[PDB]
Write a protein that binds this DNA or RNA. Structure first.
Ligand SMILES: [Mg+2]
Ligand SMILES: [Mg+2]
Ligand SMILES: [Mg+2]
Ligand SMILES: [Mg+2]
Ligand SMILES: [Mg+2]
Ligand SMILES: [Mg+2]
Ligand SMILES: [Mg+2]
Ligand SMILES: [Mg+2]
Length: 175
RNA sequence: CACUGCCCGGUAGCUAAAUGCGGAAGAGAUAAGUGCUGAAAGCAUCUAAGCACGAAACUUGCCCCGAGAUGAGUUCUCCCU
């Protein structure tokens, strides 16, 4: 609707190939591919991407409204990248990356090892910090959630793997 | 012959009180639940398109029966010239 009217201007240095509903986008950071819904039209006059409804579908401007913001993120990923910072709060909590494997120490009797997917590369500058980078926005959101899901941040001291941006609302251990 | 007359021991077999083993791990698709991206609805949103996770239940895996499975299947050999 009000999202699907506004065009996705695709900058130079970015290759865009339309194949029916399949849309590949190649750039210097990577290449990405998504099939659209059957309710969406897509076309291109050399600078802009426009997303129209195919006539006859009731969910026209919502399926075409989703398709704009998906491809608006595919362009940013192949030319800038999406980066997600994660920290650690607590005593003895520390991280370490070996190649593509985060090794966590989070208060358990066993070690914690994570296996980073095929487009995501991780970096611990600090033992209490993870910085991970990737082209696809949906995968850096999913990788960040699986690391936070080992010690979901405590409601008493904020303790555990949290996101960098968020506020963790704390509670007093009351009586 | 007297309850095997009354008793004392005891081979084999059968047995428990004797002594071996078992319930699983793993796989799949989920429940309640938890999320990721994301519009309708410029924001927000687990959901409408798409992606992940999740239980002694479910489907397997473990044991036995099983082609009268009339939908009566397969392989190997033998006999009758
Ligand atoms: Mg007599
Ligand atoms: Mg005896
Ligand atoms: Mg199992
Ligand atoms: Mg599952
Ligand atoms: Mg949104
Ligand atoms: Mg959200
Ligand atoms: Mg049990
Ligand atoms: Mg039942």
């Amino acid at each position: 609707s009000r999202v699907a009217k506004a065009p996705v201007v695709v900058p130079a240095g970015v290759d865009v190939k339309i194949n029916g509903q399949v849309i590949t986008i190649k750039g210097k950071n990577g290449e990405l591919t998504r099939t659209l819904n059957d309710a969406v039209e897509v076309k291109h006059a050399d600078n802009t991407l426009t997303f129209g409804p195919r006539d006859g579908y009731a969910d026209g401007w919502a399926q075409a409204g989703t398709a704009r913001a998906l491809l608006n993120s595919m362009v940013i990923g192949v030319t800038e990248g999406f980066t997600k910072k994660l920290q650690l709060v607590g005593v003895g909590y520390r991280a370490a990356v070996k190649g593509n494997v985060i090794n966590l120490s989070l208060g358990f009797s066993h070690p914690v090892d994570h296996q980073l997917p095929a487009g995501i590369t991780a970096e611990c500058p600090t033992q209490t910090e993870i910085v991970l980078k990737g082209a696809d926005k949906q995968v850096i959101g999913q990788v960040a959630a699986d690391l936070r899901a080992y010690r979901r941040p405590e409601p008493y001291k904020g303790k555990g793997v949290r996101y960098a941006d968020e506020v963790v609302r704390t509670k007093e251990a009351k009586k």
